[PDB]
Structure formats: C-alpha cells, structure tokens
Amino acid sequence: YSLQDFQILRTLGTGSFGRVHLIRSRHNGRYYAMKVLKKEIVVRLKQVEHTNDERLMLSIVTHPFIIRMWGTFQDAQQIFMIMDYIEGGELFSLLRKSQRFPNPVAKFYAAEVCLALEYLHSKDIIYRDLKPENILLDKNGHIKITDFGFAKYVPDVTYTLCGTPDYIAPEVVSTKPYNKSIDWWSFGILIYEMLAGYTPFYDSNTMKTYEKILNAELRFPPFFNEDVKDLLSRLITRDLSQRLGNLQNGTEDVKNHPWFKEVVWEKLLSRNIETPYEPPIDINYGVQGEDPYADLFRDF
Numbered sequence: 060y061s062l063q064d065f066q067i068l069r070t071l072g073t074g075s076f077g078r079v080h081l082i083r084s085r086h087n088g089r090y091y092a093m094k095v096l097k098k099e100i101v102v103r104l105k106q107v108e109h110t111n112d113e114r115l116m117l118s119i120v121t122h123p124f125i126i127r128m129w130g131t132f133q134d135a136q137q138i139f140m141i142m143d144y145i146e147g148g149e150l151f152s153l154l155r156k157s158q159r160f161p162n163p164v165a166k167f168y169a170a171e172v173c174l175a176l177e178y179l180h181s182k183d184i185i186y187r188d189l190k191p192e193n194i195l196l197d198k199n200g201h202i203k204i205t206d207f208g209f210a211k212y213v214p215d216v217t218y219t220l221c222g223t224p225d226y227i228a229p230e231v232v233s234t235k236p237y238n239k240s241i242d243w244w245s246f247g248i249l250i251y252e253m254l255a256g257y258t259p260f261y262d263s264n265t266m267k268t269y270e271k272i273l274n275a276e277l278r279f280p281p282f283f284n285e286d287v288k289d290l291l292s293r294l295i296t297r298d299l300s301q302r303l304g305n306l307q308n309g310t311e312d313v314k315n316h317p318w319f320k321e322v323v324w325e326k327l328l329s330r331n332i333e334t335p336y337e338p339p340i341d342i343n344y345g346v347q348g349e350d351p352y353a354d355l356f357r358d359f
Contacts (some may be wrong), residue, residue: 060129060130060131060132061132062132062134062139062344062345064084064085064086065082065083065085065091065093065130065141066082066083066085067080067081067082067093067344068080068082068083069081071092072179074094074096075104076095076097076100076101076104076106076110077095077096077097077100077101077137078095078342079092079093079094079095079235080092080093080095081093081144082141083091090144091129091141091142091143091144092141092142092143092144092145093139093140093141093142093150094139094140094142095138095140095344096110096136096138096140096158096355097136097137098136098137098138098350098352098355099136099326099352100357101178102352102355104244105235106175106356107198107356109208110138110356111355111356111358112208113206113207113208114128114131114140114209114358115359116184116207116210116228116259117207120178120179120182120184120207122174122175122178122179123143123174123201123202123328123329124171124174124175124201124202124332125145125171125175125179125203126142126145126195126201126203126204126205126249127206128141128143129141129142131221131358131359132359133356133359134344134345134346134347135193135220135346135348135349136343136346136347136350137344138359139344139359143195143197143203143311145166145197145203145205146196146197146198147189147195147197147198147200147338148194148195148336148338149192149193149194149195149196149197150168150191150192150194150195150196150202150253151190151191151192151194153196153336154191154252154253154256157313158256159253159254159255160253160254160345161254162254162284162287162298163335164251164253164335165253165254165287166318166319167323167334168194168202168253168326169249169250169253169319169336170319170322170327171202171327172189172194172202172234172246172249173202173246173310173313173314173319174324174327174328175202175204176242176243176353177310177314178195179210179239179242180239180242180309181310181311182212183212183213183214184206184210184211184212184213184239185210185211185213185217185238185239185242186207186209186210186242186245187209187210187221187222187227187242187245187344188206188208188209188210188221188222188223188226189226189239189242189245189246189249190223190226190249191249191252191253192223193205194207195234196336196338197338197339198338199330199334200334200335200336200338201330201334202358209222210341213238213239215238216236216237216238217236217237217238218234218236218237218311220232220234224265224268224269224272225248225258225268225272226245226248226249226258226271227241227244227245227272228240228241228244228245228272229272229273229297230299232269232272232273233273236304239304240299240304240305241304242304243294243302243303243304243305243313244294244295244296244302245292246304246313247290247291248295249295250287250290250291250294250297251279251291253284254280254287255280255283258303259271259275259276259277259278259295260272275290275297278290279291286316286317286318287318289316289317289318290303290316291320292315293316294313303316303350304341
C-alpha cells in the first residue's frame with residue numbers, strides 16, 4: 060500500500076493529530092478512510108505508545124462488528140492508517156437525535172456489541188472504552204466498534220485506570236486489579252443509556268461521578284421491562300461474584316439471558332438478518348526529508 064495507490068477525495072474530519080480523508084483505491088475503486096497523524100505532534104503530546112498499541116490491536120483482531128485496518132505506511136512526517144469507510148454516523152448522535160431507544164433497537168445493538176465483546180474476550184483482550192460514541196453504524200445498519208486505543212491483552216489482571224467516567228466500573232475507580240469483566244459493567248451502562256437517555260450515575264462534575272459509581276443506588280425508569288431490569292441488575296453489580304459475564308460460563312450467561320431469547324446469535328453474526336435502521340446517502344503528504352522519529356514509528 061502506497062500514497063499513490065489511492066486518490067484522496069475529501070476531508071471527513073479534523074483529529075487532534077491531523078485530518079482523515081475519504082479515499083478511493085485506484086486499483087479496484089474501493090473506499091477507505093485515511094487517518095493521518097503528524098509524528099511531530101504525536102510525540103510533542105507524549106502519545107507514541109498509545110498510537111503503536113492501537114495499530115497492533117487492529118492488526119490482530121478481525122470481526123464483522125470490529126472496524127478493520129487494511130494497512131499503514133508513512134512518509135517523512137506523518138503516518139497513514141487505511142481503514143474501513145463507515146457511512147452511517149455514531150450511535151451517540153443517533154441517540155441524542157432520538158432521545159431514547161426502544162427495547163428492541165437497544166436489544167439489537169446490544170446483541171451485536173455482545174458478539175464482538177465475546178470475540179475480544181475469547182482472546183483475553185478487553186476493550187475498556189465502551190461508549191455510544193465509539194460505536195459506528197454502516198450503511199446497512201450494522202455495528203462497527205471503533206477506537207481500540209485502550210484495549211489490552213489481559214490474561215489475568217491489570218491496573219491502568221482509563222475510560223470514560225460514567226461508563227467506568229467501580230473496581231477501576233478504586234484502583235483494584237481487574238479482568239475483562241469491567242467490559243460487562245460498561246456494557247450494562249451502554250444499555251441503560253440507550254433506554255433512558257442518560258447514564259445511571261451521571262453528574263456534571265467528575266468526582267461527584269466517581270462517587271455515585273462507587274456509592275449509589277441503581278434506580279430504573281418505569282418503562283423498563285423486567286428483563287432489562289434484571290439483566291442490568293446483574294450486569295451493573297459491584298460484586299464480581301454475581302456480575303454476568305464473569306461467571307462459570309463466561310459470555311454464555313449474557314448471551315443466554317432472557318432479554319436475548321429471540322436472538323439467533325448465528326444469523327446476526329453473519330449479517331444475514333434485518334436491521335432496525337439503515338443510515339442514508341498544510342497537506343503535503345509524501346514529503347520525505349529526514350525523520351527524527353522513524354526510530355519510533357517503525358511498525359507503520
């Protein structure tokens with residue numbers, strides 16, 4: 060893969076480390092998104108590691124519902140990340156534009172997220188940053204989990220406290236070692252938000268938030284059907300001996316919850332099912348003097 064192997068079409072957005080672009084392969088006329096990161100910056104911001112670790116993760120994970128990176132490459136001043144081109148937007152803005160989601164819609168999305176989590180987990184890889192913001196929807200309405208900046212290969216336990224305040228689990232707020240089960244806590248919060256419009260322990264200020272998370276009652280809105288109320292009740296628990304996903308049968312207990320009875324995990328996993336919504340219709344790359352950073356962006 061090379062910069063001449065494609066033809067830039069337009070800027071899709073402006074990241075902190077640089078733009079990203081809409082590109083067409085000039086070999087098969089396929090589309091991708093070029094995420095460009097200026098090395099000069101990545102390092103000014105002491106963000107080298109975080110950047111390489113994402114590339115690795117993306118190199119060792121393949122799933123219908125996990126975004127794909129077909130490759131990288133770099134010139135003398137920035138790295139390039141060729142990635143799936145997702146048409147459809149982010150589950151977050153879809154949510155806000157419609158206050159709350161209804162049981163089945165939420166159920167669908169949860170089901171696909173469950174599947175990718177099942178995968179990641181079966182390889183001792185935990186995600187760690189489950190928000191509606193990192194879930195993108197592609198043209199046909201399916202899901203694509205993005206940003207694997209916080210995913211780590213965790214065979215036993217880990218420590219690093221990261222993620223997003225509301226969707227975070229207790230054992231992380233209070234610096235304890237944790238396995239992949241935090242992912243199930245966050246999963247429960249994603250579901251609560253798709254159905255309520257808000258997170259359960261929200262609070263404009265951070266610590267006030269780590270507070271409730273740590274010491275607050277889980278109260279459900281009335282229209283919540285029992286099932287969801289039960290699932291969320293098992294998912295969003297503070298005691299890991301009872302939290303779904305961390306039990307004798309791992310993912311199976313989540314996949315087998317009543318709330319997911321009419322779900323053929325097999326049909327869904329093949330994208331051979333129907334979707335509840337289909338989304339609708341300087342810059343000097345190539346330069347190459349000396350690169351003081353090469354030593355750090357070698358795998359690219």
